[PDB]
Amino acid sequence: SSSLPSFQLTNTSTTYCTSVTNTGIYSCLRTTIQLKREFSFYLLQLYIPSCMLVIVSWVSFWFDRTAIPARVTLGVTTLLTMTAQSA
Amino acid sequence: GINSQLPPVSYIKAIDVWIGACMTFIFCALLEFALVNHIANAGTTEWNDISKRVDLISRALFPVLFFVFNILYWSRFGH
């Protein structure tokens, strides 16, 4: 588990997968591991920065309606950035 | 850029604290602009000179606070 940083090995199982083929019936074992994806990374690298990005688009609601260049620069920038992050 | 050469982990790295902090200082800068500009166009001169005051304080508060941050940061992780 210490050499597996990105995931968490939550559960394991031991089963059989004996199958019937065209050349005959072959005995088969199957071990299964269950991998749970670590969330801390996606919290910090996706969700947090996107909320922070969406929140910035709001601070333009507090600029006078006359200074629209400021509003556009905010809305457009955050939007473009949002794209990049997604890519 | 930095975060791409790293494997997703389950803990908060000292690098994250430092990126996130600087991020805040710049975010609060924007907030400051909005605050200043909003209470500036207010009719009364009561708010207008308050607007001026906010800048004066920021011009010093920001650097001082960022310096304080650096000191705390480096003593905590440069150890």
Ligand SMILES: CC[C@H](C)[C@H]1O[C@]2(CC[C@@H]1C)C[C@@H]1C[C@@H](C/C=C(\C)[C@@H](O[C@H]3C[C@H](OC)[C@@H](O[C@H]4C[C@H](OC)[C@@H](O)[C@H](C)O4)[C@H](C)O3)[C@@H](C)/C=C/C=C3\CO[C@@H]4[C@H](O)C(C)=C[C@@H](C(=O)O1)[C@]34O)O2
């Ligand atoms: C706070 C989010 C809002 C949107 C603010 O964002 C900004 C400014 C604007 C908003 C006010 C910008 C943002 C940073 C935050 C400030 C955050 C910090 C200084 C640190 O984190 C805080 C909060 C964090 O809990 C959310 C908390 O951890 C606790 C609770 C958690 O569980 C809820 C738990 O998991 C954990 C174990 O213990 C922590 C101790 O302390 C710092 C760690 C954040 C770093 C953030 C980033 C580093 O690189 C990321 C990315 O590469 C990028 C491009 C953007 C960055 C960002 O998004 O920058 C980034 O995501 O402020």
Ligand SMILES: *[C@@H]1O[C@H](CO)[C@@H](O)[C@H](O)[C@H]1NC(C)=O
């Ligand atoms: C792990 O545990 C849960 C509960 O027993 C079970 O539903 C799941 O199928 C298991 N996963 C594996 C791969 O064994």
Ligand SMILES: CCCCCCCCCCC
């Ligand atoms: C009375 C206000 C004085 C403000 C000084 C600001 C200096 C900022 C330097 C940042 C490197």
Ligand SMILES: CCCCCCCC
């Ligand atoms: C660790 C976050 C520090 C943010 C300071 C913001 C001061 C304007």
